[PDB]
Amino acid sequence: QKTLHIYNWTEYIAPDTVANFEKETGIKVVYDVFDSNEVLEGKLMAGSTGFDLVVPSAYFLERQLTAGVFQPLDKSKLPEWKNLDPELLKLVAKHDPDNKFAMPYMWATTGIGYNVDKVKAVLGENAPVDSWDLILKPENLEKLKSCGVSFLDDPEEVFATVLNYLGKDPNSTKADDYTGPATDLLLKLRPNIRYFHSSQYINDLANGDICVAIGWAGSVWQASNRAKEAKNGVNVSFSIPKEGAMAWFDVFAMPADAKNKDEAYQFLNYLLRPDVVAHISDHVFYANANKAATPLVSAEVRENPGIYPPADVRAKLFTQKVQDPKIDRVRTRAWTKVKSG
Ligand SMILES: [Cl-]
């Protein structure tokens, strides 16, 4: 019997991807899901996970290439590797030099999801939906409070977004940037924020319970699609603001103790087939990292500049850099202070 154990995010594959793979290969796939990066990182560090393929962020990969948690990918077993977009390979390479350990899977940004009609009713037809001003100017958030404002419960992404908005290095290494101006702004915004949570805003956007949220692009586009299918009239959109936004990349990686490597390479090369990953993007509303696949993606998705942004927008995106542990503890303490009154 041939088997393959995969650990991926929830709602990060097409409903029939695994079934199609099993039919084509005769491999028994055990597909498990996690809903938070803390759960994944915890298992990876403990080792002996029993997984042949896992889906970490590229950022986490850099923090583990010296630890040897993953093994290098044999490109000779991945003949369709050439389909991957070289620009995205370069960005991932900043965490995984020479792309030795990770295969780029999907990527997106952290921007603003919003209810089109409610924002325009509160702030006017000319509401600054193309700017972080929509959600980071206190005067605007005070008006939007009643219709619901949510932020991610992710200090790393939120502080980097605030720092960039203030004109500072989004990956600032100065502790006082976090405890001072970044915290000062967040505390001015806090009384207008309904909650900090990294998933509840999907359904709340789709149902009309919140009007503006900091969120992951594909999660917001999923909310927009859920609202359409519900025929409730809720019109959700997403913005990569003009001041820039954090871009991030989820990748497939192979733990060093993977027990079914041959099956894992079959699955990776399966994902490299243009129609396979294009079909996933069609369902999850995330851009994949496969350049050959882009023309096969549904027009509604590939033509959406909030999913596949053009060159001018991509040049405004920043990626997360690793920090010294002191800065990590500073961000955690400051985040608790922001959230607690
Ligand atoms: Cl990343």
Numbering used by the authors: 29 to 369
Task: Copy out sentences from the published article reporting this entry, exactly as the authors wrote them.
To gain insight into the evolution and designability of ligand binding and specificity, we analyzed the homologous PBPs, PotF and PotD, which are Escherichia coli putrescine (PUT)-binding protein and spermidine (SPD)-binding protein, respectively. Prior to this work, we grafted the seven differences in amino acids from PotD binding pocket onto PotF; this resulted in PotF_SPD, which will be referred to as PotF/D throughout this work to keep naming for mutants more concise.
The observation that SPD affinity was solely maintained and PotF/Ds crystal structure adopted a semiclosed state led us to the approaches presented in this work. Closer examination of PotF/D revealed that two mutations interfere with wildtype-like salt bridge formation. Although D39E would increase the length of the one residue involved in the proximal salt bridge and partially open the structure, the exchange from Asp to Glu still allows salt bridge formation in general. However, the second mutation S87Y seemed to have a much bigger impact on the ligand recognition of PotF as shown in the prior analysis. In PotF, this Phe points inside the binding pocket, but in PotF/D, its rotamer is vertically flipped by ∼180°. It appears that F88 and Y87 repel each other in PotF/D, driving both residues away from the binding pocket and eliminating PotD-like positioning of Y87.
